[PDB]
Amino acid sequence: TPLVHVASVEKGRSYEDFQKVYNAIALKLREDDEYDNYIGYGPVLVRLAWHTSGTWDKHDNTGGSYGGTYRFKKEFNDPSNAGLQNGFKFLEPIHKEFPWISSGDLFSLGGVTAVQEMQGPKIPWRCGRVDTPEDTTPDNGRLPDADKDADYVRTFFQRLNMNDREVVALMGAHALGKTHLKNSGYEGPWGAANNVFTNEFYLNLLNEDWKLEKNDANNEQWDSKSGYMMLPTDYSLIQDPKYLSIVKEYANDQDKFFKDFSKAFEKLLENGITFPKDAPSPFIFKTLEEQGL
Ligand code: HEM
């Protein structure tokens, strides 16, 4: 038997209210810019949007972005979530300013905000997630391991109802940010421009000379002479012939990657949620640049 989670618009709010939150997040991202050696909080916000959505299970409709359960200790302390506390504390002051927004809507909106402010595509976003109680927090272990191969990646993502194209598009977000030894047992960025959203991950995967090395934590990762790295799960995208075709596609067509990421990422953030027919349409927020702010 599967739960239903129906979206309920937080009371009386409309598009101008959520655009105000987006703007608060965007402004903080622009100011609090020294984090992680001047990478900024953009990438950890996108990670946080993904980890809070990616516990979803299509089979029983548990986990996912709806309940905003990352705020509970079982989930907050998932070893897979190590590092994400920095994104949570970045958002805490925003939530105090806008205490009316649910936790789900805030964690997911922070990811949308960060992608757009890092020059990525527009991501339509829908409000309505409702905080659910502590007993609904998912058990640890639902997020993926990095030391596996293409068959594991494909199987993992079937749980999230993601197909080959969606998975490859979604992994493009590893253009952003980096791995941190003390968080995950891997170290290094995937590329040079790690707080601008581009198709650089696919380019580097195809064009770099990758060498399998062991890092100071005794895990294997692929390293290049440029100073980039790839997780085994990243690198498996060029080992699997179906994945590789899509990697080449996104490497050679920026716009297509942007459109496919937008669709897949929205779906990720909305998995598990039922929207009434009279729910508002998806919002498309303007960036600070578009508002002239
Ligand atoms: C195979 C599945 C995935 C694996 C194994 C994986 C693994 C990792 C790991 C280990 C990190 C580094 C954390 C750290 O130690 O600092 C990371 C970072 C990141 N992941 Fe993935 N990830 C996966 C999928 C995704 C997806 C689908 C997204 C897109 C929403 C995503 C977005 C990110 C981002 C933005 C970071 C950078 C965070 C930061 O820079 O602090 N990842 N990932």
Q: Which two tokens stand for residue 207?
A: 């064009």
Ligand 1 contact via 41 beta carbon (within 6 Å)? no
C-alpha span between 293 and 279 (Å, rounded):
30
| Token couple for 283 | 């919002």
Query: Alpha-carbon distance 35 to 57, whole Å?
Result: 33
Rounded to 5 degrees, φ, ψ at 286 are -90, 145
Q: Which residue CA neighbors atom 11 of ligand 1 most closely? A: 179
Q: What are phi and psi of 230, to 5 degrees?
A: -135, 140
Annotated ligand binding at 174? The verdict is yes
**Nearest protein Cα to ligand 1, atom 30:** 50
184 lines ligand 1 (CB under 6 A): yes
Count CB-CB contacts under 10 A for residue 156.
18
116 with 31: CB under 8 angstroms?
no
* 259 CB burial (10 A radius; 0-12, 13-18, 19+): middle
The residues annotated with a catalytic role in the active site are 51, 190
Positive/negative CA dihedral, 152, 70, 18, 278: positive
The alpha carbons of the chain give a radius of gyration, in whole angstroms, of 18
Residue 218: strand, helix, or coil: coil
Q: Which atom of ligand 1 is nearest to the CA of 181?
A: 15
Six-digit token string for 43 = 């990438």
Q: Is the CB of 114 under 6 A from ligand 1?
A: no
State how far the alpha carbon of 260 is from the alpha carbons of 242, 251, 253, 255, 266, in Å.
16, 13, 11, 9, 10
Residue written as tokens 């927020």? 285
- The DSSP call for residue 275 is -
153 contacts: CB under 8 Å, gap ≥ 6:
144, 167, 233, 236, 237
CA 129, CA 7: separation in Å to the nearest integer? 5
Q: Where are the domains of the chain?
A: 3-143+265-293, 144-264
For the packed helices 200-207 and 241-251, what is the interaxial angle rounded to 10 degrees?
A: 120
Q: Among 186, 183, 220, which residue's Cα sits nearest to residue 51?
A: 183
Q: Considering the domain 144-264, what is its CATH architecture? A: Orthogonal Bundle (1.10)
CATH of the domain spanning 3-143+265-293: 1.10.520.10
The two domains 3-143+265-293 and 144-264 share their CATH topology (first three levels equal): no
Mutate which of 174, 176, 181 for ligand 1? The one with the most ligand atoms within 8 Å of its CB, which is: 174
